[PDB]
Design an enzyme around this catalytic site. Structure first.
Site, PDB file in Angstrom:
ATOM      1  CG  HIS A 128     -85.913 -68.517   4.214  1.00 58.84           C
ATOM      2  ND1 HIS A 128     -85.367 -68.735   2.969  1.00 58.84           N
ATOM      3  CD2 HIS A 128     -85.141 -69.195   5.087  1.00 58.84           C
ATOM      4  CE1 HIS A 128     -84.322 -69.539   3.087  1.00 58.84           C
ATOM      5  NE2 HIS A 128     -84.179 -69.850   4.363  1.00 58.84           N
ATOM      6  NE  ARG A 154     -84.767 -67.207   9.624  1.00 56.71           N
ATOM      7  CZ  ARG A 154     -85.196 -68.448   9.432  1.00 56.71           C
ATOM      8  NH1 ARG A 154     -84.631 -69.473  10.046  1.00 56.71           N
ATOM      9  NH2 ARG A 154     -86.196 -68.667   8.585  1.00 56.71           N
ATOM     10  CD  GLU A 199     -80.068 -73.378   8.961  1.00 53.13           C
ATOM     11  OE1 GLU A 199     -81.113 -73.431   8.268  1.00 53.13           O
ATOM     12  OE2 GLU A 199     -79.321 -72.362   9.007  1.00 53.13           O
ATOM     13  CB  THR A 228     -88.305 -77.219   6.861  1.00 51.03           C
ATOM     14  OG1 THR A 228     -89.577 -77.238   7.516  1.00 51.03           O
ATOM     15  CG2 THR A 228     -88.451 -77.380   5.365  1.00 51.03           C
ATOM     16  CG  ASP A 229     -83.196 -75.071   5.829  1.00 48.29           C
ATOM     17  OD1 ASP A 229     -83.324 -75.355   4.607  1.00 48.29           O
ATOM     18  OD2 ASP A 229     -83.105 -73.901   6.284  1.00 48.29           O
TER      19      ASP A 229
HETATM   20 MG    MG Z   1     -81.696 -72.547   6.496  1.00 45.15          MG
END
Ligand code: MG
Ligand code: K
Ligand code: K
Ligand code: K
Ligand code: K
Ligand code: K
Ligand code: K
Ligand code: MG
Ligand code: MG
Ligand code: MG
Ligand code: MG
Ligand code: MG
EC number: 4.1.2.-
Lengths: 251, 252, 252, 252, 251, 251
Positions: free
Chosen positions: C45, C70, C146, C171-172
């Site tokens: 991200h 990540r 996730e 969050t995911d």
């Molecule tokens: Mg994700």
């Protein structure tokens, strides 16, 4: 903490690598060898600022002092390199006292010079007491590469704020009307090189020289040079490849 | 207007290639100008990404060797993008089964022979109007043999029509067979496996290549009849050279 | 000559790590020099690609934190290339099943424990001659949890020997469970799921990590016994800082 | 605060888009400022990698066209990273089956509609606080139809709810059907296949796009009712322009 | 259409960001905040031309005016930045009237200056009528950072074609023999800063200043500075991270 | 082996491309067309050293001579480009004899100039006999772009070591008080252009000119220009796209 200045303060010369190939991987690998410094050549190479910046990091991580031989004796270029963590500067074509003063001006904060303040990477290395020690953290050498620089050697060596001079022997040979041969035996060039060394030492200054082989570097160290580079990455790699090919092809 | 490695082979001769793990165009061109028939850019065990490989291919071509790439993975889309950027040889890792070899072959040839997507940005510039009619011959494809499983499946891998042959990675083969990951390993079981692969490749009418870490080992592999021999990585050669320069400089 | 996160764990202590979505080496080094044990570079991200991650790993190492990544995907070849470039911790997304966890583990260990390909360009420089004999311990591997499916399969994921544990993305997880994708969500169902993952990880003798968007949430997660806690993304911290500087500058 | 292509469609009008194979921001912005509704960056048949696409997306947006990307492969993680970098249209290659179309759709929508991972670095800046509530509508997704198999499976591909429609690649379709890979092919069998895809797309209430190599062919495709028409690649237009400048300069 | 010149024409100062970290993502994010401009620092940073170019695009998209503090007052460097869409130029170490004239020369096409014509990005922003309005589309500020620049302030402020001056207070403090402290209270430095502002305003010119905090920036705005920067991205980010760590670790 | 010098020695002019867009793919594609050289513009473009370096390789591979129009007439910049394999240099804003001498100084090794020795890429192209032939391998043109350069044309043309001049007609028109229109018909500008050509030829020197169209280039070739560029990549591409859009939209 500047590894070259530590060599000097401990009575020994420094031996340094010389990179014309951009990139971090060989830079770190060579820094981890028994070199005290590694010089990145920004003059006779395709290495621009964008590519030198990570190479300085890689050399420092590998445990050698990162040096740069700049494209030109320009104060703002040099200042940006210092703030990016170049801890030695070798400036080409320093031919007069005034040009040597221009080099010195970039290497020291006011009052000693006019270096602009914003030491992004040295402040991370040295902390908030950096300012007080900043001048000692950087080694500065003016290159002696022309007949004019030879003629002006004592006036160049008189400049406060530079550690000494660095001989560019191929350019010097060429400017003397000889071939720009690496590690030359040409008697006049050999004599001029010894002259610069002697003058530098008599002035209490340091003297370096660029070499193309380990055998020549050994002689230069024995002659008393304080800073000896050997040998360019590209030349070492090309020679190694030619030998591998000859061995493989049974030639 | 010919793949220099295929020209070697058409003359009944092996090809000798360089091996780059250092990004950048200057040494790539300098080494290509030596008596290498090809220069392989290693995109697996290096920091060389696509952005950096692209200009290197150009530099190698200018220097006069065939630009090859050892990819990070046997992925058709990655391979196609390299072909269209002017990689003229592909060495693909972890080809352990016939189906994986078919996946490699699929990327190297336009339909109906394969499924290569059309948009040959750089090969069309090199080869001109005659490109499509000879496209398959302009590229060399080698499946890496670097595992116990690939060794077991060597005949099925070699049966795949659309690959020129195989490329042995001795250090990984040694490690996967339970031995130390030595450069130019001569571990007895590994030596036998390598000899088996060479014999099976030639039984199948295919080419066999091998990675080498030294000129001396490459000389032996050429004498053993290997068709494509690489020697030696730029980084390793440079580091060893520098170590020796330092030793000479610091000698009594 | 040790992974700083594993050293924390060997002392019975958690590790606190930074989180970078902005490419570049200067802030990477500056943040590594803080009291972070690791700095994670987010390649998912963010706009950080391989070309940009490579020098960042160097900068983090120089700064004195363990360089972690990540990844954008749980792909063995991508992970191997990062390891050989000096990533010493891997957090892999979308590990939803035991088999996906095995795929992660396979990339982190040389044969016979895994299938990691051999060519450790940068780890060999850091660790020297002693590298191969301790290679597995030099790397930390965490499977991201996730999704609803990963939550259902948490015990099977944790059963995979070759991963250190799991890394929760709250969050995911919230979004996949039907809730708003809030930073530092405290949605009741999500809170319970996270507590379940932590309990199952410790039941299995594994480590559990969690992403945080604030120092306060990280403090709670450390108090709850998490072994690896990240806080907070460079971009978010910088944007919030700038907003506050502007508010102060424009104040009456 | 709207996808310019979707706005065209909501008005019952087609969109016309540019097509870039040359990396860099200057021509990207210049072409975006023309009467193009979108500009597609080709990451397949070009040397444009992620590092180079990222600033191009910014430049196209500034220029006032919708930034689109034709990816090298239908891979969810690649697509997600592009979305979060501000690609607002995705054209994915080799969508040959319903399941492959579902894989495309999965990447374009947050749960529960898809499995898009959360971290919308750039869309959150463009769309602000209102982003998540309209996220799916901000992105256009088109599955490429470029093989015999995709043609056979066109109805199943079009049945996938989470894609806007399909994008025809005529040259690859021609090549896969056994014909020459001509730019703006009019090979009879290919013409019929393309007409079939258009008819099936509109029967299904979906959008149909097509790649063009010339303004004249694009004009016909717009007249035939295509919803999204690209014309023509930057490299091809530039090379043809230069050839004509040279011919004029060297004329008697 | 230059957002800073619009502020000024509407009787308000401009508040600007300050970037030392390369990259487009934070550049756009900060531009979308309530900054009127964002300055990219090419002097005390690792940002070279290759990295500044996309950052200008990102800042413009975000809705702030893209400015650059250049590495040096060099006309050709400045011209290349203008043509890449830098719409404000802050040139360091402008110490004399002649140096200020050199800055002005780069910012205007003949007859007013000697700027070379090829406005790649401004012509896309402004269209074919760009030439007639070009001078107004760019803000130019000479930095006042040395004792010499202070001494020559009125002669610098007399130069047609520059909008005014931008104080570099850390370099100025250092050149005055004080510590290069951000947002300093040192009485002599504070006095010199106020003097430059007063002189600039009396000459009908604009004056800016670099700040390290929002609180100092508020005071500078209240004192009447026309262009106030606060605070460097790296410093804001480092401080934020230290606070997050202290909070997490319960320190 | 310099393809432009071969044209000249064989009694023909050279026609060259002109790139403002960075990247290797169009550079190679255009080099493979019937251009004798391709000029990369480092002045009015976003092309920095890092991006020019691979473009030189690509142009050489494509079979045209790689040229660079530099950002500035700076010796060290020019030297670095030469060593990276730029085989023609067009230096902007050469307005005086001394500036032309500064250009010449960079293009030749001692004794003829002061070019520093380290020819990374020319030594690969030309081999160890490069030094003896180095001056001939490079074409050097001083740009004539201002009223001052016009006035000093004979003194510029007198400088040994430059091949001639290259007219920048848009800057020249602007400096004469006219619009910077490509391929202008403005009588005074047309007259000045013809004057420079005539003077150059009378001095036994070469003269080039920048063009925006093939039709104007044809006229320039007919008038006797030795080096004619046509037309910039970005302008050709933009015009092509506008026409494609008009055709598609039935406009
Ligand atoms: Mg994700
Ligand atoms: K060392
Ligand atoms: K060769
Ligand atoms: K630390
Ligand atoms: K538009
Ligand atoms: K704003
Ligand atoms: K040609
Ligand atoms: Mg020299
Ligand atoms: Mg295709
Ligand atoms: Mg392997
Ligand atoms: Mg300052
Ligand atoms: Mg001009």
């Amino acid at each position: 903490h500047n590894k070259v200045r530590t060599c000097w303060n401990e009575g020994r010369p420094a031996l340094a690598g010389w990179l014309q190939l951009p990139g971090t991987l060989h830079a770190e690998a060579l820094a981890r060898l028994d070199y005290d410094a590694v010089v990145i050549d920004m003059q006779h190479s395709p290495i621009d600022f964008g590519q030198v910046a990570p190479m300085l990091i890689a050399i420092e991580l590998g445990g050698a002092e990162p040096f740069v031989r700049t494209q030109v004796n320009d104060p703002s270029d040099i200042m940006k390199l210092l703030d990016a963590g170049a801890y030695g500067i070798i400036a080409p074509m320093v031919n007069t006292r005034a040009e040597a003063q221009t080099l010195a001006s970039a290497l020291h904060y006011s009052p000693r010079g006019l270096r602009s303040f914003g030491p992004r990477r040295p402040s991370l290395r040295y902390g908030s007491g950096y300012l007080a020690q900043a001048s000692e953290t950087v080694v500065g050498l003016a290159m002696i590469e022309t007949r004019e620089a030879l003629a002006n050697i004592d006036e160049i060596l008189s400049v406060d704020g530079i550690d000494g001079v660095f001989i560019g022997p191929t350019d010097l040979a060429l400017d003397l009307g000889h071939a720009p041969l690496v590690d030359t035996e040409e008697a006049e060039v050999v004599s001029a090189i010894a002259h610069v060394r002697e003058r530098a030492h008599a002035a209490g200054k340091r003297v370096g020289i660029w070499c193309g082989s380990g055998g020549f570097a050994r002689v230069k160290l024995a002659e008393g040079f304080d800073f000896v580079t050997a040998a360019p990455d590209l030349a070492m790699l090309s020679a190694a490849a030619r030998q591998v090919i000859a061995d493989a092809r049974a030639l």
